[PDB]
C-alpha cells in the first residue's frame, strides 16, 4: 500500500551462500554480492534503552549509534547457522545497516501481510581480506 512504500532504498544481498573456512581457519564471506532496489518505510525504534542517533563519549573519542525499524513486503533475511546464509544490508543515508531481527507477519491477512526488521548501523572499522 501507499504508506508501506513511502521510502526507496538499496539492499545488498549476498546471493551466493558458499561462505567457508579457509585451510588456515579464517572466515571467507560469500563472494557474489548483488545490489537490488526495494521499497518500504523506515522509522525510529523507540523501546527501552534503544539508542537512536545517540552520541557516545569514550576515552578514545566519540561514536554515533543508530537503529531503526523497517516495514516492507520484501523478504529480507538475517544470519542463520542452520541454513548457512548471511544477513542482508540496507543503505540508509549512504551508510550500511545490518538486519539483526525479523518478525514474520506474512500469510496472516490478505491486504496487510508484511514484515518487520530491526536494522543497526554498522560500526566503523578497517578492512582486511583472507580470501584463499
Amino acid at each position: 500500500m501507499r504508506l508501506l512504500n513511502r521510502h526507496s532504498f538499496v539492499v545488498k544481498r549476498k546471493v551466493s551462500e558458499d561462505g567457508y573456512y579457509n585451510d588456515d581457519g579464517d572466515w571467507v564471506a560469500s563472494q557474489d554480492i548483488v545490489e537490488v532496489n526495494c521499497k518500504g518505510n523506515i522509522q525510529p525504534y523507540i523501546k527501552g534503552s534503544v539508542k537512536n542517533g545517540t552520541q557516545i563519549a569514550l576515552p578514545e573519542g566519540i561514536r554515533l549509534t543508530d537503529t531503526r525499524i523497517l516495514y516492507t513486503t520484501y523478504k529480507l533475511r538475517t544470519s542463520d547457522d542452520v541454513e548457512w546464509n548471511e544477513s542482508d544490508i540496507v543503505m540508509i543515508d549512504g551508510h550500511e545497516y545490518e538486519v539483526f531481527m525479523t518478525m514474520d507477519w506474512s500469510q496472516q491477512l490478505a491486504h496487510t501481510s508484511h514484515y518487520e526488521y530491526i536494522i543497526i548501523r554498522r560500526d566503523k572499522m578497517n578492512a582486511v581480506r583472507n580470501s584463499r
Binding site: 500500500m1 512504500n5 516495514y71 491486504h111 508484511h114 518487520e116
Partner: protein
C-alpha cells in the same frame, strides 16, 4: 501495472479512463483488464464502463484489517465511490426523449402498422377532403 505511457499503450489508455492507475494499490488484475479489452472488441472507452463496475464490486467486498503494527480501514471507500459514480456516470443521459404526435413524418409512418387498433377519430379528420 500502469507503465506511464498512455499515448502509445491502449491498455494504459484504459487504465486512465478507469481510475486504476496507482501502482501501489492495483485493484484490477492485468489479465482481467486484457480480457475485458478483448471482449469489448477493441474499444478503450467501452472497456472502461465494465472495468468500473468490476471495480465497484471489488471495493464493496473488502473490510477493515489489522495486523501487528499496520492497520487499514476500507469501510468508507465504497460509500464515497458509489456517490462519485452515481453522479458522474449513472445520471449522465444520452439520446433523445420521444414526444407523442409532434411530427407528421412520423405519424404517417406509424399509420402503416397493420396490427394497430383503429381509432374512431384522428386529429386531422375535420379537414380531410377525401375522408378516411
Amino acid at each position: 501495472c500502469y507503465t506511464g505511457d498512455p499515448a502509445n499503450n491502449p491498455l494504459d489508455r484504459v487504465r486512465i479512463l478507469c481510475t486504476d492507475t496507482n501502482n501501489d494499490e492495483i485493484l484490477i488484475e492485468q489479465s482481467v483488464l486484457e480480457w475485458f479489452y478483448l471482449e469489448s472488441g477493441k474499444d478503450e472507452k467501452k472497456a472502461a464502463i465494465k472495468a468500473l463496475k468490476y471495480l465497484l464490486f471489488q471495493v464493496a467486498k473488502m473490510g477493515d484489517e489489522k495486523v501487528g503494527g499496520v492497520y487499514l480501514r476500507n469501510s468508507s471507500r465504497f460509500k464515497s465511490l458509489k456517490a462519485v459514480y452515481d453522479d458522474l456516470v449513472k445520471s449522465s443521459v444520452s439520446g433523445l426523449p420521444y414526444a407523442g404526435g409532434i411530427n407528421q413524418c412520423d405519424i404517417d409512418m406509424r399509420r402503416q402498422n397493420p396490427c394497430s387498433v383503429k381509432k374512431y377519430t384522428e386529429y386531422g379528420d375535420a379537414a380531410r377532403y377525401e375522408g378516411r
